[PDB]
Amino acid sequence: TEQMTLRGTLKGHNGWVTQIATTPQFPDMILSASRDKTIIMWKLTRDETNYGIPQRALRGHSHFVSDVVISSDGQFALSGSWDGTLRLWDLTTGTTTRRFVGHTKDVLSVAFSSDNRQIVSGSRDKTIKLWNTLGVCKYTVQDESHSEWVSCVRFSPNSSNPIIVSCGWDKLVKVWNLANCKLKTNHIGHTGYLNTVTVSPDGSLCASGGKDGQAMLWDLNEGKHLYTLDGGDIINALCFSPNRYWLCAATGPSIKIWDLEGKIIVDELKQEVISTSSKAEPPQCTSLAWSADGQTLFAGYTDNLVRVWQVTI
Amino acid sequence: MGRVRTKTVKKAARVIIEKYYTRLGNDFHTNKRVCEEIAIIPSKKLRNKIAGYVTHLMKRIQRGPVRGISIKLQEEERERRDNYVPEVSALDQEIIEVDPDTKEMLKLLDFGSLSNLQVTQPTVGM
RNA sequence: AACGAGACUCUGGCAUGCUAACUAGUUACGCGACCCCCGAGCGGUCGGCGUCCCCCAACUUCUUAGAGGGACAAGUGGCGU
């Protein structure tokens, strides 16, 4: 079966990498966020000396940047921050065209709609919130929301079932109808708080995880439970492959992949030892992205680096 | 210089960990946000000092016991050293040797018949 | 268990992020005016100098001052019953 190998590393940051984002429109570009308050745009290269260079940096947020996402045309990017404000960036000039305001705490995740005509967000303020791209808020979920911090929000990629999924510190996963503005279904099972939720590109399955170290699968349209996978110590991020039936997870200092035909671990990715006089000797992995080609993986870390892996035979 | 923490900081940090161990971790910037919603703290400068000692105590509790703090996860494995151990399926067996003056003490008590015997040294060890 | 200590109150150093100013400014131009040709090049569109003057132009970097943010011995290496 297929096996990963280390390609190279990217060095231009002064705090933990918080997220990475990519598109099929520009395969020599990637974009990433950090606790150093700024978003970096990278020029990738196939040169033997170093795999990429910081090309531009976006500087307008006043605390940490928590989430970042790119428009399907590759012209614009959207981001949230621990300063409680949400911003839309023109990637050609490196300037914000609009600013979104109306949360009263601290913003943990954001997404674009699959048509890119609507925006959604989640926060420590306990409210999910919906926005028009002209910067005006359109609905607020309030009493039916999570009882604790809203950790994540995501859209289904398909057009024929317009719904969103979410996870929170009250250890529930919830599913919501877009046009009707209402809750559809709870899912219950996890013992710890939740860090992440994700959906397969065919629009069929969820995955979710957090402190309990378990990845659990769920149906989007059949409304029911599927099998549980033990990850290890903790789950920081999850993603599906774009062209294989694989789930991938970032788990403490290591990254891991499951082949879902026959439910088996393909490989686990680890770091060369730097001897350290304390517990948690290695730095942890914080975020993942597969390239639009599917053949290469980007991963971010608490040691201010992005590490790149290829597939091999 | 002096960076020693006063009893107002050290007592509030212990009471937080007794009630909210499942919320906490190694990241100071996340602990600083948790301690602001589970407690009323009058000053920003006091909140930072409490979340600092909570972050120090979490890294100790990952290694072993701290005498002033208790949690279910550590009590139930104490309760597994309590009750019975995996060490052996039977007692240390009663087939043990007897000295001549213990043989004589048991003879006067109408007992014996199950022990081997040998004598000690010719004179008291010096 | 109580008072003193510490916390606490005022103050200094950071924010091209927020709120928004004819009793505070900048940039720019519809432009208008004086002086110099030193300037590719003319006595010019274009250059230089301005506490010289309008804006029914755009804006908040520099000034004012309200709200929040930020630092914890928090990170790494030694020494410590």
From Swiss-Prot, chain A:
<feature type="modified residue" description="Phosphoserine">
    <location>
        <position position="277"/>
    </location>
</feature>
<keyword id="KW-0689">Ribosomal protein</keyword>
<keyword id="KW-0539">Nucleus</keyword>
<dbReference type="GO" id="GO:0030425">
    <property type="term" value="C:dendrite"/>
</dbReference>
<keyword id="KW-0306">Gastrulation</keyword>
<feature type="modified residue" description="N6-acetyllysine">
    <location>
        <position position="182"/>
    </location>
</feature>
<dbReference type="GO" id="GO:0048471">
    <property type="term" value="C:perinuclear region of cytoplasm"/>
</dbReference>
<dbReference type="GO" id="GO:0043204">
    <property type="term" value="C:perikaryon"/>
</dbReference>
<keyword id="KW-0007">Acetylation</keyword>
<feature type="repeat" description="WD 5">
    <location>
        <begin position="189"/>
        <end position="219"/>
    </location>
</feature>
<dbReference type="GO" id="GO:0007369">
    <property type="term" value="P:gastrulation"/>
</dbReference>
<dbReference type="InterPro" id="IPR020472">
    <property type="entry name" value="G-protein_beta_WD-40_rep"/>
</dbReference>
<keyword id="KW-0131">Cell cycle</keyword>
<feature type="modified residue" description="Phosphothreonine">
    <location>
        <position position="5"/>
    </location>
</feature>
<dbReference type="GO" id="GO:1990904">
    <property type="term" value="C:ribonucleoprotein complex"/>
</dbReference>
<keyword id="KW-0217">Developmental protein</keyword>
<comment type="function">
    <text>Scaffolding protein involved in the recruitment, assembly and/or regulation of a variety of signaling molecules. Interacts with a wide variety of proteins and plays a role in many cellular processes. Component of the 40S ribosomal subunit involved in translational repression. Involved in the initiation of the ribosome quality control (RQC), a pathway that takes place when a ribosome has stalled during translation, by promoting ubiquitination of a subset of 40S ribosomal subunits. Binds to and stabilizes activated protein kinase C (PKC), increasing PKC-mediated phosphorylation.</text>
</comment>
<feature type="repeat" description="WD 4">
    <location>
        <begin position="145"/>
        <end position="177"/>
    </location>
</feature>
<keyword id="KW-0677">Repeat</keyword>
<feature type="repeat" description="WD 1">
    <location>
        <begin position="12"/>
        <end position="43"/>
    </location>
</feature>
<dbReference type="InterPro" id="IPR045223">
    <property type="entry name" value="RACK1-like"/>
</dbReference>
<keyword id="KW-1003">Cell membrane</keyword>
UniProtKB/Swiss-Prot annotation, chain B:
<keyword id="KW-0597">Phosphoprotein</keyword>
<comment type="function">
    <text>Component of the small ribosomal subunit. The ribosome is a large ribonucleoprotein complex responsible for the synthesis of proteins in the cell. Part of the small subunit (SSU) processome, first precursor of the small eukaryotic ribosomal subunit. During the assembly of the SSU processome in the nucleolus, many ribosome biogenesis factors, an RNA chaperone and ribosomal proteins associate with the nascent pre-rRNA and work in concert to generate RNA folding, modifications, rearrangements and cleavage as well as targeted degradation of pre-ribosomal RNA by the RNA exosome.</text>
</comment>
<feature type="cross-link" description="Glycyl lysine isopeptide (Lys-Gly) (interchain with G-Cter in SUMO2); alternate">
    <location>
        <position position="103"/>
    </location>
</feature>
<dbReference type="GO" id="GO:0022626">
    <property type="term" value="C:cytosolic ribosome"/>
</dbReference>
<dbReference type="GO" id="GO:1990904">
    <property type="term" value="C:ribonucleoprotein complex"/>
</dbReference>
<keyword id="KW-1017">Isopeptide bond</keyword>
<keyword id="KW-0539">Nucleus</keyword>
<protein>
    <recommendedName>
        <fullName>Small ribosomal subunit protein eS17</fullName>
    </recommendedName>
</protein>
<feature type="modified residue" description="N6-succinyllysine">
    <location>
        <position position="19"/>
    </location>
</feature>
<comment type="similarity">
    <text>Belongs to the eukaryotic ribosomal protein eS17 family.</text>
</comment>
<dbReference type="GO" id="GO:0003735">
    <property type="term" value="F:structural constituent of ribosome"/>
</dbReference>
<dbReference type="Pfam" id="PF00833">
    <property type="entry name" value="Ribosomal_S17e"/>
</dbReference>
<dbReference type="InterPro" id="IPR018273">
    <property type="entry name" value="Ribosomal_eS17_CS"/>
</dbReference>
<dbReference type="InterPro" id="IPR036401">
    <property type="entry name" value="Ribosomal_eS17_sf"/>
</dbReference>
<feature type="modified residue" description="Phosphoserine">
    <location>
        <position position="113"/>
    </location>
</feature>
<keyword id="KW-0963">Cytoplasm</keyword>
<keyword id="KW-0687">Ribonucleoprotein</keyword>
<dbReference type="InterPro" id="IPR001210">
    <property type="entry name" value="Ribosomal_eS17"/>
</dbReference>
<dbReference type="GO" id="GO:0005730">
    <property type="term" value="C:nucleolus"/>
</dbReference>
<comment type="subunit">
    <text>Component of the small ribosomal subunit. Part of the small subunit (SSU) processome, composed of more than 70 proteins and the RNA chaperone small nucleolar RNA (snoRNA) U3.</text>
</comment>
<dbReference type="GO" id="GO:0006412">
    <property type="term" value="P:translation"/>
</dbReference>
<keyword id="KW-0832">Ubl conjugation</keyword>
